[PDB]
């Protein structure tokens, strides 16, 4: 392509990095260093305490939650030698999952999703992972992680993660993220089952809004999952020097999982389209019954009103000079034709 | 040699010859007045207000050594922004934009730029532009424009256009914010018409902005010899701003679509409820019209004469059927 440089933005000083987000509540740096023999964990809020970990033999996992603090991000990037555009991408959350391979580090942007039962939003938060010689730098917007299994594996010496380097740590984080995606798909399964139960019982406008927001959420999920598939493909099919020769089959497993997620998302979309069609048919039927009632009454009272007007005539010479029970005869005739046409419409299975 | 546009009100020539030493400006109506400035070493700016005056634009076309095809493109108005490179000069087409919030209207005017050796020509449609900041900068030395060459003037012109796009985006932003409340709360027909108009304006803006991004990209990636390398980064800056505009209009587009969807899919409920209203009105009043017509159905007999004070009694039984309709619909929850 072209040379990479910090793009200028109107209304800002030339070198400003801006956090492109909405979360500004909390911020802390948790450091988890681990080897086979021992491990040390500590939380803090000063970057000068975590900087000494740039040069360390044992693998380490730095996790900075809260990126509204641009100062700590800039300091970490300039100490770790990270390119300023990668820092700009870390603080920009209006992106899609991506992977960039550099000489001394690899930069990965992924997304964490959260589904709320109430009001049925689909909140998203990017996670940025910079993989270095022996350090994994994680940047998050707010608290709430899906990497607690990885933390437990490090803490209690399960698996083989303590015996491997930072590449396996990056694997553990991505695998936990994909498992979170599976859990999100399960939540969407529950939501679509409940909404399908409700759709044919109460065809209301809130059902319309729920279905449309579900479709939009599925579209956004696909827009996220496809670049995730591309990143996982590039990780094991275009291997940088940072990732060792082994651990590639692990990335292959994650790529297979992403394939599964994409297929599930496409099936989800076709199911919800069918559900919307079913709702439209149900509402059309609900209008149809009211239409049947209207046409029943109209066909009852058009000709009878005509003949009432014809016999409400004020002309000089009408049969209003009547033979015995003439008006009862006329009303009996009108009633019998009314019941005959009622019988016909019953033969039509409307009344 | 045809003017495709619809503006023919006025026409005048604005000339600005400026150097590091002195500057001088003309507001005339003679084509020959701009002739001596084709070979002037110092940077020169020509502004031709009226394209419909085909004679003057053609005359400057032959005198400045431009091919007739770009002249026809200049005369044409309703064409997307584009760039074209020659070994003598460079030709650019860009779009003005004005937005009336009171009428929710969007208007575009085409401007054509021709950067030749140490001089710039510009062609507009109406009077009024967004290059007044550039004129002030040239006049009172508010920048570095008088210390630089003619290719910096093209930068200034395009930058001013991009700033006008930013102002138009601010206006569209406030209109979108109003219309979102107009849709989510109390939807109404005029709000739907406003949404359609905004969709048209946004699609036109996108179809205009993307070619402008391509034009500035082609300008700064493979720079022609007309534009100096020193001024290449400045163009890059302007190019970046275009991306900015791109994203926001895209976002705006999405929002509008969503709004429309929320109104569009909830249309079967409207017909359902209005059919309910008409059906209940008929259900209640057609039988009562029958009762009135048949009890008023003229005869000599009229067996209901006197008949225990007559009409109020039938009113009662009439009222009877009336209520037995409404409660039934209360059973049906219609109304």
């Amino acid at each position: 392509m072209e040379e990479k440089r910090l793009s200028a933005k109107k209304g800002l000083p030339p070198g400003t990095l801006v956090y492109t987000g909405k979360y500004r509540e909390d911020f802390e740096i948790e450091v988890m260093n681990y080897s086979i023999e021992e491990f040390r964990e500590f939380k803090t809020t000063d970057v000068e305490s975590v900087l000494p970990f740039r040069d360390s033999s044992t693998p380490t996992w730095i996790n900075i939650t809260g990126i509204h603090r641009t100062d700590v991000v800039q300091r970490v990037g300039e100490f770790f030698g990270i390119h300023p555009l990668v820092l700009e991408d870390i603080l920009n959350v209006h992106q899609r999952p991506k992977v960039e391979f550099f000489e001394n580090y690899v930069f990965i942007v992924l997304k964490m999703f959260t589904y709320d039962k109430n009001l049925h939003e689909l909140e998203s938060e990017q996670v940025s992972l910079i993989l270095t010689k022996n350090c994994v730098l994680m940047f998050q917007e707010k608290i709430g992680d899906v990497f607690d299994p990885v933390r437990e594996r490090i803490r209690y010496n399960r698996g083989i993660i303590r015996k491997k380097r930072a590449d396996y740590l990056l694997y553990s984080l991505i695998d936990a993220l994909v498992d979170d995606y599976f859990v999100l798909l399960e939540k969407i399964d529950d939501e679509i089952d409940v909404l399908e139960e409700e759709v044919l019982e109460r065809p209301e406008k809130e059902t319309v809004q729920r279905t449309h927001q579900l479709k939009r959420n599925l579209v956004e999920l696909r827009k996220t999952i496809w670049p995730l598939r591309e990143v996982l493909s590039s990780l094991y099919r275009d291997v940088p020097p940072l990732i060792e020769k082994e651990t590639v089959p692990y990335f292959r497993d994650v790529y297979d999982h992403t394939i599964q997620i994409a297929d599930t998302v496409e099936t989800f979309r076709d199911i919800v389209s069918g559900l919307l069609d079913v709702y439209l048919s149900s509402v059309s039927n609900k209008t149809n019954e009211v239409m049947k009632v209207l046409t029943i009454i109209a066909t009852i009272f058009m000709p009878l009103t005509f003949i009432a007007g014809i016999y409400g005539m004020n002309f000089e010479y009408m049969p209003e000079l009547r033979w015995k029970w003439g008006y009862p005869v006329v009303l009996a005739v009108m009633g019998v034709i009314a019941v005959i046409m009622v019988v016909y419409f019953k033969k039509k299975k409307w009344l | 040699l045809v003017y495709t546009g619809k503006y023919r009100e006025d026409f005048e020539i604005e000339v600005m010859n400026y150097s590091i030493e002195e500057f001088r400006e003309f507001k005339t109506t003679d084509v020959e007045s701009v002739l001596p400035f084709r070979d002037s070493s110092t940077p020169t700016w020509i502004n031709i207000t009226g394209i419909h005056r085909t004679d003057v634009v053609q005359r400057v076309g032959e005198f400045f050594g431009i091919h007739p095809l770009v002249l026809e493109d200049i005369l044409n108005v309703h064409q997307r922004p584009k760039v074209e490179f020659f070994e003598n000069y460079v030709f650019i087409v860009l779009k003005m934009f004005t937005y009336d919030k009171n009428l929710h209207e969007l208007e575009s005017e085409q401007v054509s730029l021709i950067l030749t050796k140490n001089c710039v020509l510009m062609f507009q449609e109406k009077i009024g532009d967004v290059f007044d900041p550039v004129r002030e900068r040239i006049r009172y030395n508010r920048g570095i424009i008088r210390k630089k060459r003619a290719d910096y003037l093209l930068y200034s012109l395009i930058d001013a256009l991009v700033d006008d796009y930013f102002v138009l985006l601010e206006k569209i932003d406030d209109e979108i914010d109003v219309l979102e409340e107009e849709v989510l709360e109390r939807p109404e027909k005029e709000t739907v018409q406003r949404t359609h108009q905004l969709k048209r304006n946004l699609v036109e803006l996108r179809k205009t902005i993307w070619p402008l991004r391509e034009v500035l990209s082609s300008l700064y990636r493979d720079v022609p010899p007309l534009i100096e390398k020193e001024t290449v980064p400045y163009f890059r800056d302007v190019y970046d701003h275009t991306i900015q505009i791109a994203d926001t209009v895209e976002t705006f587009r999405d929002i509008v679509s969503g709004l429309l969807d929320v109104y569009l899919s909830s249309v079967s409920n409207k017909t359902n409820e209005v059919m309910k209203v008409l059906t209940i009105i008929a259900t209640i009043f057609m039988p009562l019209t029958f009762i009135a017509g048949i009890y008023g159905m003229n005869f000599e007999y009229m067996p209901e004469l006197r008949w225990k004070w007559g009409y109020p009694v039938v009113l009662a039984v009439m009222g009877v059927i009336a209520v037995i309709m409404v409660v039934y619909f209360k059973k049906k929850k219609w109304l």
Partner: antibody
Amino acid sequence: ISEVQLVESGGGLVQPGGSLRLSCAASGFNVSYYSIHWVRQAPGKGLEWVASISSSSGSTSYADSVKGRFTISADTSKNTAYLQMNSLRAEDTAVYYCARSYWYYIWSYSYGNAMDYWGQGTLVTVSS
Amino acid sequence: DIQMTQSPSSLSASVGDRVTITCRASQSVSSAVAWYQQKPGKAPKLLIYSASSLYSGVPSRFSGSRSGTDFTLTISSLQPEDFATYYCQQSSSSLITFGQGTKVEIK
């Protein structure tokens, strides 16, 4: 370490037409990473922004009422922001505050800044 | 300069009442509006930014809304520590401006 705090000094009585420099020292952040603003509140009147600085780029901005005489500078070595006021008249008697702002995101083309922390405010009087 | 006109200027209410203050900009600003409060003799405290977003640490009672060029701050459940002077600010341009304040006093 510690907490964000801006302490400003240098304000005092000055004769009309004179000049003086007001300094603002930070503690809790590097001055270059964020933008530093000066806000002037006349005695018994509302706030009136005067100047801004981004030390990392020197993109100084001045209000129209004080442009041409006030200058704003920032040095990272001392972590200080200075406002030098020359040609000071009797309308410039007020209390001055040294605020720190952060940029936030609204739209792609739209950016806005909001001031997290404020100083104490130094009283600058210009009379007799 | 983009002028912000804030109304009213001498609002008064008791504890538990609802307070609304609206400032309008002479020129369109793309939701880059902040609301501050100032107690007598102290520095202003940031309350609202982005015209809707709530600053961290302030009580949840304060709220902000935008309608076109109008921006309204609302105090729902007023408390005896909300009696200060509230100011608008627009950061749409480099030349940022302020409103002339709105004192909320006792009744």
